[PDB]
């Protein structure tokens, strides 16, 4: 879980997005593999957004 | 092996000589402690009498554990068993009547328990029977009785994993407007959650509804079934309600479950922790030193297997592997035993439900692709 | 025609004045009464309750909490007997399941921070960051916080959106190190710190509250007097936010006016008929008379316009209604009263209630951060 290199025309579009409305762009990666979904857990019947 | 006091409360008609075969019968040498049995009958339905003879079980004799059973389904005495139980800070479980019937909102400080499945687990059994029903038409109509939003979202939880399109028609929170609102009923099954007395007038509005006729089904719970020998004339004809055993499961066998689960409850604790509690000072006099109780023993006492069947009481108090019985009312004016449901596992008598309009279309064949 | 009504409390002078209550009560057709002391042993408590109360055979009984603690009420349910409560600002007593019958004299903390939810216009702050201890009564408390919160969405169905929420955190009871809680607090841009706790509960709350300066100037930490009561003043943080339930000191006069409404209830019992007198012997009476539910439809329906404590009200749960809490601004290591709600009546103080930071100035906790993460 350590920093590595990231680039892409998409992420670039993020960069330009900040280039309009300025906010320092912090690059983090994903933890899990999926994008995300409200999903059913294994117990307790509570909404899990993945 | 030290013999620690165990209060066995026999309410109503019971066999004491046979209770010696359900208590004094044997002791398991596999354990570093021994049972010490206390069996008496106080038939009073006043809770202050439970305080009386129970506080006498602590006052005169010295008990490290207690057990009780009820001669009726009234759970106020169970609420007592909670309050005074934690007051004593000792576990116990109802083996019969309303004592075996659990109530909502188990007390935190309470280590007491009861013999029966969770209302959640209950509905789960209702789903295994829904598989036994092989019917896709369901719905929800229920009152403000305990677990309302709870068992609501618990139904939504049981079907929350459902891939099949089995239709649960609608949710109804029960409360002239009885039949007026309930007329929208469609699905063949009749299922509800309320008290049994609540089910008396509810069943009155059900006879008033008349939608309960043949070709439809009726589902009710274990406690909602109440006394099998007690049939309100207004309930659905031969209504299908699975329950914990009002016949098969032995109440003296339940006594073996209590004293056993006490001993095995002492098994690993006495083994490693080697800690067994002393009897309470007094109903009056135990208030101060009452701080001497900790949560380890019962927590250690969680995982257990009674007669080989898992004896672990749920954090909510239910049984880890509760033994439930597929059951129904009959048209013979008796509750028909429809089988047994052990956790997800279940059994039944026949390959079809009890079963103008045509019965069904066989139209036998064999798959021929395409 | 003496009607028996019960009571319980710690104060014996309140028992003298309770016998006094039976008198002018008998004036406002006759009254009966019986009493029982407070027993440290719960077994003795409800035991001697059943001794007196069953023999007393009153429809309902007052009870105090000299500090759940209603096992005598657990005996009332055995007869399904009505129960009249006063003390606890905790809503575990307000759970209807366990005790189907209890009547709180005044509303518990149930609306406490919800009064701050009313203050959402007062402070005009639409960002709600939720801290709590972890417990049952607290769980339901923040649950209600969601309710009134979610209630706005229903009202929002139909001024710059509405009172947005934030993370809800219930701190495990008796938190040694709250560093997790305040840690989460650091990431919050909002200045609104919402929590309520008991004294030893609130220990790390107010104590460690500024340990990281998580209360750092401009951070609004609001709570109730039940959170401000107790040791809370010892370590009390600068310029903390909170109020005090009106007449929230003692339940004595609440027992006076409480009898004030009690006479209206038994008056309805006089306005009714065919009621079931409570049985005497606890042992020997195995059936709860239907008068218990009658006591629900009656004692519940009882509403007195104004009592000795002010307007005598009850919620749908039957505690109080439109009850007031006195806004008390923290100053000079003390809480100076800044006003009181009706429940709805905004009372601004005479002096400006100063934030823990500079004066009273209203910050905006919505401030964005330059760091933008993805």
UniProtKB/Swiss-Prot annotation, chain A:
Q: What does the entry state regarding organ or tissue expression?
A: Detected throughout the brain, in brain cortex, cerebellum, thalamus and olfactory bulb.
| The record's note on its domains | A hydrophobic region that gives rise to the prediction of a transmembrane span does not cross the membrane, but is part of a discontinuously helical region that dips into the membrane and is probably part of the pore and of the selectivity filter.
Family, as annotated: Belongs to the glutamate-gated ion channel (TC 1.A.10.1) family. NR1/GRIN1 subfamily.
Give the protein name, as stated in the record. Answer: Glutamate receptor ionotropic, NMDA 1
Its biological purpose: Component of N-methyl-D-aspartate (NMDA) receptors (NMDARs) that function as heterotetrameric, ligand-gated cation channels with high calcium permeability and voltage-dependent block by Mg(2+). NMDARs participate in synaptic plasticity for learning and memory formation by contributing to the long-term potentiation (LTP). Channel activation requires binding of the neurotransmitter L-glutamate to the GluN2 subunit, glycine or D-serine binding to the GluN1 subunit, plus membrane depolarization to eliminate channel inhibition by Mg(2+).
**Entire-sequence positions represented here:** 450 to 499 of 938
Q: Give compartment(s).
A: Cell membrane; Postsynaptic cell membrane; Synaptic cell membrane; Postsynaptic density membrane
Q: Which organism is it from?
A: Rattus norvegicus (Rat)
Quaternary structure (record): Heterotetramer; the NMDAR subunits are modular and harbor tiered domains that function in concert to regulate opening and closing of the cation-selective ion channel pore. Forms heterotetrameric channels composed of two GluN1/zeta subunits (GRIN1), and two identical GluN2/epsilon subunits (GRIN2A, GRIN2B, GRIN2C or GRIN2D) or GluN3 subunits (GRIN3A or GRIN3B) (in vitro). Can also form heterotetrameric channels that contain at least two GluN1 subunits and at least two different GluN2 subunits (or a combination of one GluN2 and one GluN3 subunits) (in vitro).
Sugar attachment sites: 22, 42
Processing after translation:
NMDA is probably regulated by C-terminal phosphorylation of an isoform of NR1 by PKC. Its phosphorylated state is influenced by the formation of the NMDAR-PPP2CB complex and the NMDAR channel activity.
Curated annotation (Swiss-Prot), chain B:
Compartment annotation: Cell membrane; Postsynaptic cell membrane; Late endosome; Lysosome
Q: Which residues lie on this side of the membrane: Extracellular?
A: 1-370
Q: Which residues bind Zn(2+)?
A: 96, 246
Q: What is the effect of changing residue 246 to A?
A: Reduced zinc binding
Q: How is it modified after translation?
A: Phosphorylated on tyrosine residues.
Which family is annotated?
Belongs to the glutamate-gated ion channel (TC 1.A.10.1) family. NR2B/GRIN2B subfamily.
Q: What is known of its domains?
A: The extracellular N-terminal domain (ATD/NTD) endows NMDARs with a unique capacity for allosteric modulation, harboring several binding sites for small molecule ligands that act as subunit-specific allosteric modulators of ion channel activity.
What is the role of the protein in this entry?
Answer: Component of N-methyl-D-aspartate (NMDA) receptors (NMDARs) that function as heterotetrameric, ligand-gated cation channels with high calcium permeability and voltage-dependent block by Mg(2+). Participates in synaptic plasticity for learning and memory formation by contributing to the long-term depression (LTD) of hippocampus membrane currents. Channel activation requires binding of the neurotransmitter L-glutamate to the GluN2 subunit, glycine or D-serine binding to the GluN1 subunit, plus membrane depolarization to eliminate channel inhibition by Mg(2+).
The protein in question is named Glutamate receptor ionotropic, NMDA 2B
**What residues of the intact protein does this structure contain?**
32 to 415 of 1482
């Amino acid at each position: 879980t350590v920093p590595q290199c990231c680039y892409g025309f998409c992420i670039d579009l993020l960069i330009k997005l900040a280039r309009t409305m300025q906010f320092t762009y912090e690059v983090h990666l994903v933890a899990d593999g999926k994008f995300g979904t409200q999903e059913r857990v294994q117990n307790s019947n509570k909404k899990e957004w993945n | 092996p030290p013999s620690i006091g165990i209060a066995v409360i026999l309410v109503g008609t019971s066999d004491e000589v046979a209770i010696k075969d359900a208590h004094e019968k044997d002791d398991f040498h596999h354990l570093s402690v021994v049972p010490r049995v206390e069996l008496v009958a106080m038939n009073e339905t006043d809770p202050k009498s439970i305080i009386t003879r129970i506080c006498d079980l602590m006052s005169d004799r010295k008990i490290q554990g207690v057990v009780f059973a009820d001669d009726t389904d009234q759970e106020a005495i169970a609420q007592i068993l909670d309050f005074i139980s934690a007051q004593t800070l000792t576990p116990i479980l109802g083996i019969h009547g309303g004592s075996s019937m659990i109530m909502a909102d188990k007390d935190e400080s309470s280590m007491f328990f009861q013999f029966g499945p969770s209302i959640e687990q209950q509905a789960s059994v209702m789903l295994n029977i829904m598989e036994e029903y092989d019917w896709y038409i369901f719905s929800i109509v229920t009152t403000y009785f305990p677990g309302y939003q709870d068992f609501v979202n618990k139904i939504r939880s049981t079907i929350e994993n459902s891939f099949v399109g089995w239709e649960l028609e609608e949710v109804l929170l029960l409360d002239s407007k009885i039949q007026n609102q309930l007329k929208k009923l469609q699905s063949p099954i009749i299922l509800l959650y309320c008290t049994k007395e609540e089910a008396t007038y509810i069943f009155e509005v059900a006879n008033s509804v008349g939608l309960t006729g043949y070709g439809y089904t009726w589902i009710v719970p274990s406690l909602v079934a109440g006394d099998t020998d007690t049939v309100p004339s207004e309930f659905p004809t031969g209504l299908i309600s699975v329950s914990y055993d009002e016949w098969d499961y032995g109440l003296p066998a339940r006594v073996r479950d209590g004293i056993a689960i006490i001993t095995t409850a002492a098994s690993d604790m006495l083994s490693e922790h080697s800690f067994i509690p002393e009897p309470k000072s007094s109903c009056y006099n135990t208030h101060e030193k009452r701080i001497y109780q900790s949560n380890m023993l019962n927590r250690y006492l969680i995982n257990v297997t009674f007669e080989g069947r898992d004896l672990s009481f749920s954090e909510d108090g239910y049984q880890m592997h509760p033994k439930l019985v597929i059951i129904l009312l009959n048209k013979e004016r008796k509750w028909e035993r429809v089988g047994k449901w052990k956790d997800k596992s279940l059994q039944m008598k026949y390959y079809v439900w009890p079963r103008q309009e045509d019965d069904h279309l066989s139209i036998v064949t064999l798959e021929e692709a395409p | 025609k003496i009607v028996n009504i019960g009571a319980v409390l710690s104060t014996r002078k309140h028992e003298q004045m309770f016998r006094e209550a039976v008198n002018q009560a008998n004036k406002r057709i006759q009254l009966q009464a019986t009493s029982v002391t407070h027993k440290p042993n719960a077994i003795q408590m409800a035991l001697s309750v059943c001794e007196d109360l069953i023999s007393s055979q009153v429809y309902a009984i007052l009870v105090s909490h000299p500090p759940t603690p209603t096992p005598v009420s657990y005996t009332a349910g055995f007869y399904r007997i009505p129960v009249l409560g006063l003390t606890t600002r905790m809503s575990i007593y307000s759970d209807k399941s366990i005790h189907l019958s209890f009547l709180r004299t005044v509303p518990p903390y149930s609306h406490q921070s919800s009064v701050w939810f009313e203050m959402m216009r007062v402070y005009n702050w639409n960002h709600i960051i939720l801290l709590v201890s972890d417990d049952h009564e607290g769980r339901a408390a923040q649950k209600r916080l969601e309710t009134l919160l979610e209630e706005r969405e229903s009202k929002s169905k139909k001024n710059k959106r509405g009172p947005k929420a934030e993370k809800v955190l219930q701190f495990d009871p008796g938190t040694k190190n709250v560093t997790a809680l305040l840690m989460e607090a650091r990431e919050l841009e909002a200045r609104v710190i919402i929590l309520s706790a008991s004294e030893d509960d609130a220990a790390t709350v107010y104590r460690a509250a500024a340990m990281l300066d998580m209360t750092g100037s401009g951070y609004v930490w609001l709570v109730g007097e039940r959170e401000i009561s107790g040791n809370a003043l010892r370590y009390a943080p600068d310029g903390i936010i909170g109020l005090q339930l009106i007449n929230g000191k003692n339940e004595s006069a609440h027992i006076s006016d409480a009898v004030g409404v009690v006479a209206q209830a038994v008056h309805e019992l006089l306005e009714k008929e065919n009621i079931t007198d409570p049985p005497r012997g606890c042992v020997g009476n195995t059936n709860i008379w239907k008068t218990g539910p009658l006591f629900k439809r009656v004692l519940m329906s009882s509403k007195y316009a104004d009592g000795v404590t002010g307007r005598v009200e009850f919620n749908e749960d039957g505690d109080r209604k439109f009850a007031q809490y006195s806004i008390m601004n923290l100053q000079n290591r003390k809480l100076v009263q800044v006003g009181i709600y009706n429940g709805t009546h905004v009372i601004p103080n005479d002096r400006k209630i100063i934030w823990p930071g500079g004066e009273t100035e209203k910050p905006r906790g919505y401030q964005m951060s330059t760091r933008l993460k993805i």
